[PDB]
């Protein structure tokens, strides 16, 4: 069982998200300090295009996927499902703009 985090694009097991949170998105989703609700809405088990990144800084792939500022690991090219409007508004309150990785927005 593995899920792909909608916001940052990392892929980790769902129990890892429940116990430890997303290591990158914890600063704005508080996933480590949240219930299965936020895990289910901000991470999706249906994805495609597994990506492993070793060096975020110099990888053009990381820049193209906007993951060069995140922890190395498993990443997904496309994630089914989008973030809800309230979470988008909360991110806009923090000043961070959310660009969907579902592919439908370009």
């Amino acid at each position: 069982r593995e899920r792909a985090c909608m916001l940052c694009g990392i892929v980790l097991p769902g129990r890892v998200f429940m116990q430890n949170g997303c290591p990158n998105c914890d600063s704005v989703l508080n996933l480590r300090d949240s219930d299965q609700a936020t895990v289910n809405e901000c991470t999706s088990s249906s994805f495609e295009g597994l990506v492993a990144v070793g060096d975020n800084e110099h990888s053009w792939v990381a820049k193209w996927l906007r993951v060069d500022r995140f922890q190395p690991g498993l990443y997904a090219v496309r994630v089914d499902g989008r973030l809800p409007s309230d979470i988008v508004a909360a991110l806009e309150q923090y000043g961070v703009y959310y660009r969907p990785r579902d592919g439908s927005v370009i």
Partner: peptide
């Protein structure tokens, strides 16, 4: 942006 992230010659192969 998204358009600026296009690949150049000096990018890794």
């Amino acid at each position: 942006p998204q358009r600026l992230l296009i690949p150049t010659v000096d990018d890794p192969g």
